[PDB]
Amino acid sequence: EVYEGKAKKMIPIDDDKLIMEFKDDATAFDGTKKARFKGKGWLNAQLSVIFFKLLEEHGIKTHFIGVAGGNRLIVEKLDMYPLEVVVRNVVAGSLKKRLPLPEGYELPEPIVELYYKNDELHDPMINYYHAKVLGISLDEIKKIEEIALKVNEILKDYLAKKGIILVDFKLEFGKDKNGDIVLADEISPDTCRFWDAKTKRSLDKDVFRFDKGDLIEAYKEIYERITGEKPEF
Amino acid sequence: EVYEGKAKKMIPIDDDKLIMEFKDDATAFDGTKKARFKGKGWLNAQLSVIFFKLLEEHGIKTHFIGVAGGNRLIVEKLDMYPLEVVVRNVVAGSLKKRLPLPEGYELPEPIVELYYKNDELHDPMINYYHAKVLGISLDEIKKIEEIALKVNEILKDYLAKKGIILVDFKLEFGKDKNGDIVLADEISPDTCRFWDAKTKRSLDKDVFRFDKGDLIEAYKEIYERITGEKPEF
Ligand SMILES: Nc1ncnc2c1ncn2[C@@H]1O[C@H](COP(=O)(O)OP(=O)(O)O)[C@@H](O)[C@H]1O
Ligand SMILES: Nc1ncnc2c1ncn2[C@@H]1O[C@H](COP(=O)(O)OP(=O)(O)O)[C@@H](O)[C@H]1O
Ligand SMILES: [Mg+2]
Ligand SMILES: [Mg+2]
């Protein structure tokens, strides 16, 4: 059986591999807002590949194995932590409701937030003690955050050289058969906030969230600035 | 000028001392539910004194200096951290909305949660990174939690020998002139969950929160079980 999530489908290959297929569907505000954008899947697939390859070069262990053409990646099957790990460099989104700081406030150092993946409870934020009750040891949490913080440096530096501010982003992790902590899911304009360095405008899912313009146009601009090429689809 | 909070008034004495006066007012659900209970102030004052004295004996630094008769304590003036520090031994209250665990679930080890004191944002939970942005260093946070966890052991052990389960409780802290971290505010049936060991019933502000019975009767039962004496008022 294939798992069909809000944005991607996961097709089993064997015991240790999956196909991650990116859909054109977009959801927001915990699923209340919905639309489909032709080519969104392709862009998010291609961009994930570029980011995973960049991170692998820097010695980040990711689930990325290869491409299966189109909107499909081949990825290592992992035993997933029930976490969303959010790294924040610039104040935006939900952080404005947690710290009395304005949108665009540049953080002196990165913030890491842990969210417990649980639909029933609406993905509440947790700390290290909650994580322990969930079966995640302090060492594991520490290794996870150390990876997220390294990922942050690499992506923000890379993107800055392209005139893009990495505002924040969301990661997921799992364990491989050796018990190593492996970066999973996706890295795309769906799961990151990207702002133009010159204009400060959103080139990410916030365009869809708040009707700030044309989503495909914004995701394309990201692809074009990153690759140097115009997207083929 | 005197500071008048929801439950207590703080009267300045000199440069380094305050009077903490406990009122009969009770509030719940971030101030939406209100009532007054005659003698509540007295009970919460007396009980805070007993707890602060118990903790001082165990080498916990608290703001407790002495009594000024009635509902008034003399306390050291501190430069307060903008935090509420919650220690949890048994699942109850807001934790049920954060972990899919039932009320009464006994935790394998204590949970410490940090809340940023901010009316505008409704006291959101924060982690160590948020605390840093707020000007609280990691060392400070670590010392705070180490104290809270020690306080927990002492109170839970003490209360268990009296047939009372310490379910959770909320602490506040500030810095003294030497830059030491000093336990502040109050320790009472207002700020702790106390359950009868035999019956599991609430002997705390939850009685008022959820109309579980007579608040004064419940606070009295706590006083009587702790002191061995019937409250004089
Ligand atoms: N390497 C992996 N192994 C197993 N599961 C993964 C891996 N990477 C991502 N996942 C999970 O696969 C699903 C990806 O599809 P998605 O549309 O994002 O689903 P959802 O809407 O549940 O987040 C998610 O449940 C995600 O946690
Ligand atoms: N030692 C102390 N020094 C300075 N302020 C304190 C001390 N202990 C408690 N406080 C503060 O004094 C007030 C106590 O009264 P309270 O009725 O609880 O007010 P509030 O409704 O604002 O919590 C709180 O603002 C508390 O943080
Ligand atoms: Mg997802
Ligand atoms: Mg108070």
UniProtKB/Swiss-Prot annotation, chains A, B:
MF terms (GO), sorted A to Z: ATP binding; phosphoribosylaminoimidazolesuccinocarboxamide synthase activity
InterPro entries tied to this protein: SAICAR_synt/ADE2_N, SAICAR_synt_PurC, SAICAR_synth, SAICAR_synthetase, SAICAR_synthetase_CS
Keywords: ATP-binding, Ligase, Nucleotide-binding, Purine biosynthesis
Pathway: Purine metabolism; IMP biosynthesis via de novo pathway; 5-amino-1-(5-phospho-D-ribosyl)imidazole-4-carboxamide from 5-amino-1-(5-phospho-D-ribosyl)imidazole-4-carboxylate: step 1/2
One GO term (biological process): cobalamin biosynthetic process
CDD domains recorded: SAICAR_synt_PurC (cd01415)
Substrates-to-products reaction catalysed: 5-amino-1-(5-phospho-D-ribosyl)imidazole-4-carboxylate + L-aspartate + ATP = (2S)-2-[5-amino-1-(5-phospho-beta-D-ribosyl)imidazole-4-carboxamido]succinate + ADP + phosphate + 2 H(+)
Pfam families, A to Z: SAICAR_synt (PF01259)
Catalytic activity, EC: 6.3.2.6
NCBIfam families hit by this protein: purC
Family listed: Belongs to the SAICAR synthetase family.
HAMAP family noted in UniProt: SAICAR_synth
Name of this chain's protein: Phosphoribosylaminoimidazole-succinocarboxamide synthase
Organism of provenance: Pyrococcus horikoshii (strain ATCC 700860 / DSM 12428 / JCM 9974 / NBRC 100139 / OT-3)
Gene name per UniProt: purC
